[PDB]
């Protein structure tokens with residue numbers, strides 16, 4: 001069925017995205033040193049800088065992915 | 079200058095790369111599915127089920143999110 005085939009290709013695309021960019025997200029978080037106190041400020045300034053050069057679905061979902069990593073990073077620390 | 083600005087521009091490159099790498103695949107996948115207004119939600123739920131049968135990470139979720147956007151826009155524009 002095309003549904004299962006599409007799901008399986010999305011899985012490989014997802015894992016490709018994970019592998020390609022997760023270490024880059026790690027490094028960005030290292031440089032940012034976010035805290036619970038500054039996470040919202042940082043996320044909105046990052047988004048502002050991102051969208052200053054345009055918007056497409058790729059940029060939106062990259063921001064959401066990074067924002068989830070940012071929240072989780074702050075959670076697991078402080 | 080500011081680290082937040084630099085991170086925003088690095089996400090701009092990443093997002094443009096994700097757009098470049100997979101948008102044609104999403105379009106082909108939508109051509110093969112032939113989704114309509116009435117079956118798109120059930121198509122999306124079965125695809126998501128098929129996707130997460132092999133696990134979950136943030137890359138998989140954002141791929142699904144971006145595909146869902148393309149699916150919705152496709153159905154929308156093609157009924158017009």
Ligand SMILES: CCCCCCCCCCCCO[C@@H]1O[C@H](CO)[C@@H](O[C@H]2O[C@H](CO)[C@@H](O)[C@H](O)[C@H]2O)[C@H](O)[C@H]1O
Nearest residue numbers: 018022064065067068069072134135136137139140143
């Ligand atoms: C607005 C709509 C929502 C937008 C939110 C963005 C998408 C949300 C992502 C949900 C992902 C949850 O899925 C979860 O992914 C993370 C990160 O990949 C995986 O976690 C793994 O990678 C992280 C990355 O830092 C490591 O720290 C961790 O030790 C490891 O387990 C989990 O195994 C998986 O359970």
